[PDB]
Symmetry: none
């Protein structure tokens, strides 16, 4: 929270392919 960049598919040159599914970092669920 103090400092976060969070950057995806940035500064891409040429042909780029990919995909992101799910992926969870930290956080609290079901308390």
């Amino acid at each position: 929270v103090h400092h976060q960049k969070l950057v995806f598919f940035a500064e891409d040159v040429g042909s780029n392919k990919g995909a992101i599914i799910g992926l969870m970092v930290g956080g609290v669920v079901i308390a």
Copy 2:
């Protein structure tokens, strides 16, 4: 919260393909 960039699909040159599904960072649910 202090400093966040949060940038996606920025400064893209040429052909770029991709997709983002779900993906959760931090946060609180079901308290």
Copy 3:
């Protein structure tokens, strides 16, 4: 909240394709 950029699909040159589904950062639900 202090400083946020929040920029998507900006400064795009050429052909760019993509999609964003869901994606949650921080926040509070169900208190």
Copy 4:
């Protein structure tokens, strides 16, 4: 709140395609 840019589909040159669904940052619901 102090400083926010919030910019989407800006400064786009050429052909650009994409879509945003949901996506929630911060905020408080159901108190």
Copy 5:
């Protein structure tokens, strides 16, 4: 389209908590 029910949070008894984010079924975007 022929027959759809589409019912959420219906016939609820007692204490129920939950949330729905995104979620897309069918449909056509970016043609």
Copy 6:
């Protein structure tokens, strides 16, 4: 499309907690 029920959090009795993020079935994007 011919026949769809699509029912969530229905007929709930007692205490129930949960959450749904993303989740995509079928559909066409980026054509």
Copy 7:
């Protein structure tokens, strides 16, 4: 499409907890 039920958190009795992240069935993206 011919016949779909699609039912979640239905007919729940007592205490139930859980969460769904991502999860994709079928569909076409990036054409």
Copy 8:
């Protein structure tokens, strides 16, 4: 597509806990 049930956390009695992350069946991405 011809016939799908797709049912999760249904007909639950008593105390039930669990979580689903990712999980992909079929579908086509990056064409």
